[PDB]
Structure 1
């Protein structure tokens, strides 16, 4: 991809040669690996037009195997342009461009002629929509009266999609394909600013309602193949739908609801994870809109954690929680404010909400049943100690709950190290060193701003226990452990 930025022609020339060889030759070959290089080469709007024209000329004469490879490769190329050049995609609909429309239309017919059987239709339908998207006005005419031949073949295909998309037809394969194709149409729409308010927005609204019932029906789990559900597919739909209508999502509650199966929860958390990490377009909605569900998110953590620990000490049901729990932990690592909003505050007879969160993360570090999770729990607790994230624990008094809870964590973890030897002992110590660094800074600024800084009994009763664990590590056999322990003084 990096190489293709400058010397496009050199790479592009190689592809053109292979097409000609296959075009003239009549002995079908399976060395299409050269053809499949389009999926990685950087493409721009002007360059993309070249690809369509060249393949169009030679498409009809290619062999069956070659035709499939170019179709798949061309599909993945389209997204590269949109992602790498978001602005150019918007301008396509902002101002008409006949040249872009012309090449797509010719290719559309060639692909349509190629696919006759139901099995063929499944492979090519995802591509056809992208081509249809490229030509804006052909969509408008399809909605209105249909031209004799110009907009006749297109209109027949578009309505054929809905039948399989709605399950009317007795064809599972087309039903599966219709989902894939429809999602991509929704995904592409997200980039459209909607200021044009073209038919694209209207077209999606027609199919969105039907799509959700197929993918978000708790009674019937949509099972594309061997896996119980196509987890990846649902994620794209939910993320896209959110961006279209972020104000009041209607399925967030359905997925977030406890009665729904775990897989619905798994899709929900991952979706919230992408929003935080991958937001290219500014005018998209942000995670802030979801803060209102923070209270409900925490409740899920408690149930998942409680059942996860019990299993370690059904077969796949237990394993499901561990995977779900791992995803939940990573979510807090991405953004801690999501779960810390609307603090419960310490009850007269019950503990608050910020405390129960820390205790759950702490009880995973010395586990050794789930080493992969434990590694993350260390990182998670190390992010809630940054000066920025200390405040959110209890905004009423940020310099009283910190020492009450943070110190109590040290007392629990330190007592574990001294109690007996563990396999990961040499690793917990390196993490414990940075915790001390990250609570000195909070005291330094706290003392500067206002000395007033408190020293409750736990601060003393836990300062002792810290020392009792740094002497006992000096005789530890591991050379790294003793060196690290000495530096902790």
Structure 2
């Protein structure tokens, strides 16, 4: 439920005065709800928590102390004590004066708080107390990033955060004993890392310990997920940002290379690659706002990245990854992002890599029939539009006419495709091809059969019916063309070869 500050006071007051003698197993779920609602109160209301640290409403603390006392009595230092500790911590955050006071009756708070530090180093005790202390401290760090430099617990934050009692339990390159139910609570991990970044942006040890190659790739998954979170969940901790992260980038475009090489051939590499391609979808600049090794021409870095993406779209072993690779390659082709592909002379490198990408796509597409093919075909539509705009925003075929002809080879070869959708999409995107030829220039000697292509646009956008009637319409418009082309002839020969194998197969 939604909970505001006065509403929170009402909730905790009501639960407080009736919180006597309630059932312990009932009180466990009560404590869990009391934990959960506080975060919603944090997230929806931006600055009311800020106000708490300027004008202390002592009524909230007075209400919270009774809950403190009964829950502390409820522990008896048992396993239940663990379930005390997270909500227990939140409470202290809700008493700004007793934090300075704790560092007569307030001595009771000391008997967990120092004990908290005593359990934060994992000194003695059990694993359960250690884990619960870690969860509580992570929630503490997550809370205190909403404070704006009042320094009440920011000094206490610096005490318990950059201590290895927080780090070396979680960010330890070896001994990841974290828990047994899950290999590592990546939500716990991500909250600790993200909070530590948004406290000290220019500190870089915690980035370094996970971006190491000899570091286990679980840390790498944590890092890429955390970067996606920083990309998305903005406006809170608004003063840190990814701009300091921009420079620390070369090992990312490297790590993409090694992980892609592994994913060509445990099993979590798939999830890790999925996360990285999702991040590339999230922000284009990060992998390429870098020292441009694309500038060196022996192997262009941005070109290498694009080819590494393109190697994934035809493969159906990892179909969902193909869906976001699809999307990411679409996003890189945006009007702003392509300028980032090369700081200097972006036009040549952009056109070369776009021509190479269409060549590889059309060759692999005409090579064989795949299940995703129609979707891939739809993708080509958008790709064409973007590069069309590019030339219009700009106003040479070493390879461009080769991939150009290989495009309409695929268009004609899908004009016979059994599925209706592929026929509609190809017969639609013929207009994009002819409109590109229009933007190139009149006489249209560069592209013959132009009026037939406009007629393809019309026959695309009258009507949708059964397969047979559109087949006759396609037959008629194919009959109506008159000027031979290399692409037409090549498509005919390829279809003839396919027909020979098909008929030989059918007869036997």
Instruction: Please say if 1:242 is aligned against 2:208.
Output: no
Deviation at 1:401, TM superposition (A): 0.8
Matched-pair contact (CA < 8 Å) for 1:291–1:341 = yes
Following superposition, the deviation at residue 61 of structure 1 comes to: 1.6
Q: Alpha carbons of 1:248 and 1:85: their partners in 2 closer, same or farther (altered >3 Å)?
A: same
* Bigger Cα displacement from structure 2, 162-171 vs 233-242: 162-171
Equivalent position SS for 2:18: helix
Distance 1:282 1:165 in 2: 25
| CA distances 1:100-127 after superposition (whole Å, capped 9, x unpaired) | 1111112111111111142110011111
Instruction: Kindly indicate whether the alpha-carbon contact (under 8 Å) linking 1:56 and 1:106 is maintained by their aligned counterparts in 2.
Output: yes
Cα gap change, 1:325/1:222 in structure 2, threshold over 3 Å: closer, same or farther? same
Task: Work out the CA distance in 1 between the residues paired with 2:194 and 2:296.
Answer: 41
State the alpha-carbon separation in 2 of the partners of residues 207 and 416 from structure 1. 52
Retained in 2: the 8 A contact 1:343–1:394? no
- Is the CA contact (8 Å cut-off) linking 2:144 and 2:154 kept in structure 1? no
Say whether the 8 Å CA contact 1:186–1:204 is kept in structure 2: no
Give me the whole-angstrom Cα distance separating, in 1, the residues matched to 2:285 and 2:136. 36
Give the whole-Å Cα distance in 1 for the aligned partners of 2:16 and 2:336. 57
Aligned Cα root-mean-square deviation (Å): 1.6
Change (3 A) 1:251 1:468: same
Secondary structure of the 2:182 match is coil
Q: Provide Cα deviations, 1:306-325, integer angstroms capped at 9, x if missing partner.
A: 01011xxxxxxx41111101
The 1-side partners of 2:341 and 2:307 are apart by 13
* Contact 1:194/1:201 (8 A) holds in 2: no
Q: Give the unaligned 5+ runs of structure 1.
A: 1-40, 144-148, 311-317, 448-454
The answer to whether the 8 Å contact 1:180/1:233 transfers is yes
Contact 2:416–2:423 (CA under 8 A) maintained in structure 1: yes
Question: What do residues 6-42 of structure 1 show as CA deviations (whole Å, max 9, x unaligned)?
Answer: xxxxxxxxxxxxxxxxxxxxxxxxxxxxxxxxxxx11
- Asked if the contact 1:189–1:200 (Cα under 8 Å) also holds between the matched residues in 2, the reply is no
- Partner residue of 2:424? 483
Report how far residue 203 of structure 1 moved.
6.0
The 3 A distance-change label for structure 1 pair 433 and 349 is closer
Relative distance call for 1:56 and 1:441 in structure 2 (3 A) is same
Deviation digits for residues 203-262 of structure 1, max 9, x if unmatched? 654674320010011110132123221111100000000000111221201100101001
Q: How many correspondences in the alignment?
A: 430
CA contact (8 A) 1:71 1:127 kept: yes
Q: Is the 8 A contact 1:45 1:81 kept in 2?
A: yes
Distance 2:365 2:285 in 1: 31
Distance 1:75 1:247 in 2: 32
Deviation, structure 1 residue 199: 5.6
Contact 1:415 1:465 survives alignment (8 Å)? yes
Structure 1 residue 441 displacement after superposition: 0.6
Give the Cα separation in 2 of the matches to 1:244 and 1:416: 48
- Distance in 1 between residues matched to 2:127 and 2:296, nearest whole Å: 58
Deviation at 1:58, TM superposition (A): 1.5
**What's the CA shift for 1:431?**
0.5
Match of 2:18 among 26, 50, 58: 58
More off after superposition, 301-310 vs 161-170: 161-170
The secondary structure found in structure 1 opposite 2:249 is helix
Please give the alpha-carbon distance, in whole angstroms, between the structure 2 residues aligned to 1:473 and 1:425. Answer: 10
Once the two structures are superposed, what CA deviation does each residue of 1:402-454 show, in whole Å capped at 9, x if it has no partner? 1111111000000111111111111110001110011101111111xxxxxxx
Alignment check: 8 A CA contact 2:99 2:152 kept? no
Using the alignment, how far apart are the partners of 2:413 and 2:346 within structure 1?
Answer: 34
Equivalent position SS for 1:387: coil
Give the whole-Å Cα distance in 2 for the aligned partners of 1:394 and 1:93.
48
Equivalent position SS for 1:259: coil
CA deviations on 1:290-310 (whole Å, 9 max, x unpaired) are 111211110000000001011
Q: Describe the shift of the 1:332–1:166 C-alpha distance in structure 2 as closer, same or farther (beyond 3 A).
A: same
TM-fit CA distance, 1:284? 2.7
Shift of 1:62: 0.8
Is the 8 Å Cα contact of residues 75 and 81 (structure 2) preserved in structure 1? yes
In 2: Cα distance, 1:199 partner to 1:307 partner: 43
Q: Call closer, same or farther: CA 1:363–1:219 in 2, change over 3 Å.
A: same
| Of 208-217 and 331-340, the range deviating more from structure 2 | 208-217
Q: Note closer, same or farther for the CA distance 1:461–1:206 as it changes in structure 2 (3 Å cut).
A: closer
Residues 477 and 290 of structure 1: is their aligned pair in 2 closer, same or farther, counting only changes over 3 Å?
same
Q: For residue 205 of structure 2, give the secondary structure of its aligned residue in structure 1.
A: coil
* Counterpart secondary structure, 1:59: coil
Q: Does 1:68 align with 2:28?
A: yes
User: Given the alignment, which residue of 67, 73, 83 partners 2:43?
Assistant: 83
CA contact (8 A) 2:285 2:340 kept: yes
Deviation at 1:200, TM superposition (A): 5.6
CA pair 203-53 structure 1, distance change in 2 beyond 3 A: farther
Q: Aligned equivalents of 2:248 and 2:296: distance in 1?
A: 25
Kept in 1, the 8 Å contact 2:338–2:346? The answer is yes
TM-score (norm 1): 0.85
Please say which of residues 247-256 and 188-197 is displaced more in the overlay: 188-197
Map 1:161-200; keep pairs closer than 5 Å.
161-198=116-153
Distance 1:343 1:468, change over 3 A: farther
SS of residue matched to 1:488: helix
1:352-395 deviation per Cα after TM superposition (whole angstroms, max 9, x unaligned): 11110000000001111111111111001000011100100001
Question: Which structure: larger Rg?
Answer: 2
Q: CA deviation at 1:150?
A: 2.1
Q: CA–CA distance in 1 between the matches of 2:54 and 2:410?
A: 67
Report the CA distance shift for 1:458/1:207 in structure 2 as closer, same or farther (over 3 A): closer
The answer on whether the counterparts of 2:295 and 2:342 sit within 8 Å (CA) in structure 1 is no
Q: State the shift of 1:347 in Å.
A: 6.6
